[PDB]
Amino acid sequence: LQPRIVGEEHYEIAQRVKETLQRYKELQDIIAILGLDELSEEDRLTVARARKIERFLSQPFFVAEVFTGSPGKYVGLAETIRGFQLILSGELDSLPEQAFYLVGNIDEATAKAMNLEMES
Amino acid sequence: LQPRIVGEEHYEIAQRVKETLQRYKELQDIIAILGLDELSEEDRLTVARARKIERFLSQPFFVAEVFTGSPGKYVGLAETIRGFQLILSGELDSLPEQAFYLVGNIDEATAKAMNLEMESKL
Amino acid sequence: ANLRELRDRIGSVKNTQKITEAMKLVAAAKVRRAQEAVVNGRPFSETLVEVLYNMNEQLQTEDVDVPLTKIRTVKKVALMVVTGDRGLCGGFNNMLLKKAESRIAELKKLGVDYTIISIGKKGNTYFIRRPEIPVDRYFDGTNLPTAKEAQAIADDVFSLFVSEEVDKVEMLYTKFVSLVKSDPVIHTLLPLSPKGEICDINGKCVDAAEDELFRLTTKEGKLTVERDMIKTETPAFSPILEFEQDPAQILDALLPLYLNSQILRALQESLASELAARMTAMSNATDNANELKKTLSINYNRARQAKITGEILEIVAGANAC
Amino acid sequence: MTLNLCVLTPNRSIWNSEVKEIILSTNSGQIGVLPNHAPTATAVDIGILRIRLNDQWLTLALMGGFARIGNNEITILVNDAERGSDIDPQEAQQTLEIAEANLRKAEGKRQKIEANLALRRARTRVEASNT
């Protein structure tokens, strides 16, 4: 993970993902005793984006099709970079977290959010 | 304390006594804030039955008699469960809390209650 | 020196649990005092509504023309928001300011030239940090809300409306309807019906389901609140009153009392709902601190046994090498 | 020996005792009430409600409201009625000077009515705290 080896776009997106996850891990104990209701606006936006990120980091595997079903997705590199660019950019802030859980290629997270708000 | 070992009757009455005492323990703070009047009716009867039960768990001992003086009682399990059935269903609710305290054998609780009421009639 | 670190951390979690349950209990006591204030200030408004209903049933054919009760539909808007004083708030001030944003959103979209009269300290902090919304006056709770805060707010709202500058003075606040859920309401204040009922922002007389005089009773072993329909109201009779004052001036002097009554009751209800939200937040904080105390005591006992094991195994290894 | 009198602010009942002779500063001026008055429901200006306990004459400091005379059970719904005399006049004149001062700066149309009402309340405060 060096900008000369993985390019600068991949490096910057990995840096920002790790920065928001580190801020989340920092304030985790305060939001453990008190709760989310006492954070500032930017801190609660950071929390929501970190939950979106840690849900989008999961993936269904081909070899775990016996454990979950919903068969495994091979997610390429550019699709992962674009998905996290969309999460961190502010576009996908108005859709459920459960649309990100156990999907790949964030077009499928958008499709799952559409399916969730349609099936209700 | 399992049904197979002690009888379904004994198990159910012991569980009901545990629930009653636990509800009173949870409700002591609210009774400290609101009071017994600003509670509800089921909660109020629960609190009164719980005070009576907590005082019924006392006993005068044969070996502690030597400084306390009370003659000391032996209470088998059958009289225990027959007394707690009566103190838990509404058969003995018109009694003072200091009537069940430091007795055995719920008939003695009713007798000391009648004496504590004679103290008032007199 | 890691075991003393864990010991002091466990001690801090124990103390935090203790003070959170203390805050819970004193907030419950202040909820009881707020319901006391509400049910003590009620009968003034009871006699006020019976007098005003009789007076307006005697004054329909007349010309009354009182500036508070006129309907000047040239559509300005003065939405007043009252929020919590101090923090931890459950989720009080956030949803209040959120409904405030939603209301000014529908307002500015219709170009109705809104404005804001912020009452609470958290709300007015929010508004001084966001100047993109216009705001008129600032108030606080270090001053007692039972008399002086309500009097000042009534003075300012009266001076805003009688000097006929803005129409539709409504108040966004939070009636205490549940211990967990406190949904805010938007009720109009000054463009009132001469009959004298509280209305909705639509005007559809929400006195129909206002549900006065909340009380607190436990249901099974946990605290809940009870709200019934009607209590100790005697509005019916209309005896001869022999008005010495001109009838227009009688309502002209009566309606400020109704302004003060409504403002004071809304302040008291928002205060009781803020204290209920704080009671719930402190109950949750005490329970989370209890579970964290249990987890930290578990990890501490593990680390203590591991420390003892390592120490004796090292001593025995050295003694066996020797 | 007199009518029942209850002065009632919004938040509380101030005092519900019965006294003999009351001068009620209305919007039409001062009017005296008698025990066994015929019922007159009037208004009350920002002014002075003087009472008489048949042992001593006393004043009550109120900031407006409304009054009702009934069958010797009279009710006066007031705005801000402080019982008896709770203040001394030095801080009253310290409020008078600042109310007349801020009358000048508060010169916009709404500030006219606001400062005027603050003045009528400061004046009734001082003329109630004279005794």
Swiss-Prot record, chain B:
- GO MF term (any one): proton-transporting ATP synthase activity, rotational mechanism
| Gene Ontology terms: cellular component | chloroplast thylakoid membrane; mitochondrion; proton-transporting ATP synthase complex
Q: Which GO terms describe its biological process?
A: proton motive force-driven mitochondrial ATP synthesis
Query: What keywords tag this UniProt record?
Result: ATP synthesis, ATP-binding, CF(1), Chloroplast, Hydrogen ion transport, Ion transport, Membrane, Nucleotide-binding, Plastid, Thylakoid, Translocase, Transport
Location (main, coarse): plastid
What's the domain of life for this entry? Eukaryota
Assembly and partners are described as: F-type ATPases have 2 components, CF(1) - the catalytic core - and CF(0) - the membrane proton channel. CF(1) has five subunits: alpha(3), beta(3), gamma(1), delta(1), epsilon(1). CF(0) has four main subunits: a(1), b(1), b'(1) and c(9-12).
Instruction: From the Swiss-Prot or TrEMBL record, give the protein name.
Output: ATP synthase subunit beta, chloroplastic
Q: Which organism is it from?
A: Spinacia oleracea
Q: What is the lineage of its organism?
A: Eukaryota, Viridiplantae, Streptophyta, Embryophyta, Tracheophyta
What range of the parent protein does this fragment cover? Answer: 375 to 496 of 498
Swiss-Prot record, chain C:
Keyword rRNA-binding tagged: no
The topology of this chain with respect to the membrane is: Peripheral membrane protein
- Location of the protein in the cell: Plastid, Chloroplast thylakoid membrane
Kindly list the cysteine pairs connected by disulfide bridges: C199-C205
Q: Which molecular-function annotation in GO is an example for this chain? A: proton-transporting ATP synthase activity, rotational mechanism
How does it get modified post-translation? Disulfide bond; Cys-199 and Cys-205 are known to form a disulfide bridge in the dark which gives rise to an inactive enzyme. Activation can be brought about by a ferredoxin-dependent reduction of the disulfide bond in the light.
Q: What does this protein do?
A: Produces ATP from ADP in the presence of a proton gradient across the membrane. The gamma chain is believed to be important in regulating ATPase activity and the flow of protons through the CF(0) complex.
- What quaternary structure, including any partners, is listed in this protein's UniProt entry? F-type ATPases have 2 components, CF(1) - the catalytic core - and CF(0) - the membrane proton channel. CF(1) has five subunits: alpha(3), beta(3), gamma(1), delta(1), epsilon(1). CF(0) has four main subunits: a, b, b' and c.
Q: Anything else of interest in the record?
A: Alkylation of Cys-89 results in the inactivation of ATP synthesis.
Q: Which PANTHER family is this protein grouped with?
A: ATP SYNTHASE GAMMA CHAIN, ATP SYNTHASE GAMMA CHAIN, CHLOROPLASTIC
Q: What is this protein called?
A: ATP synthase gamma chain, chloroplastic
Species: Spinacia oleracea (Spinach)
Q: What is this protein's gene name?
A: ATPC
Swiss-Prot record, chain D:
The record gives the membrane topology as: Peripheral membrane protein
The residue range of the signal peptide is none
Q: Which GO terms describe its cellular component?
A: chloroplast thylakoid membrane; proton-transporting ATP synthase complex
* Record keyword Transport present: yes
Q: Annotated Gene Ontology MF terms?
A: ATP binding; proton-transporting ATP synthase activity, rotational mechanism
Q: Which Pfam families match?
A: ATP-synt_DE, ATP-synt_DE_N
**SUPFAM superfamilies recorded for this chain?**
Epsilon subunit of F1F0-ATP synthase N-terminal domain (SSF51344)
Nucleotide-binding in keyword set: no
User: What keyword terms does UniProt attach to this protein?
Assistant: ATP synthesis, CF(1), Chloroplast, Hydrogen ion transport, Ion transport, Membrane, Plastid, Thylakoid, Transport
Compartments, record wording = Plastid, Chloroplast thylakoid membrane
Main location per UniProt?
plastid
Q: A GO BP term, please?
A: proton motive force-driven ATP synthesis
Family note? Belongs to the ATPase epsilon chain family.
Q: How does it assemble?
A: F-type ATPases have 2 components, CF(1) - the catalytic core - and CF(0) - the membrane proton channel. CF(1) has five subunits: alpha(3), beta(3), gamma(1), delta(1), epsilon(1). CF(0) has three main subunits: a, b and c.
This molecule's function is given as: Produces ATP from ADP in the presence of a proton gradient across the membrane.
* Protein name stated in the entry: ATP synthase epsilon chain, chloroplastic
The record lists the organism as: Spinacia oleracea
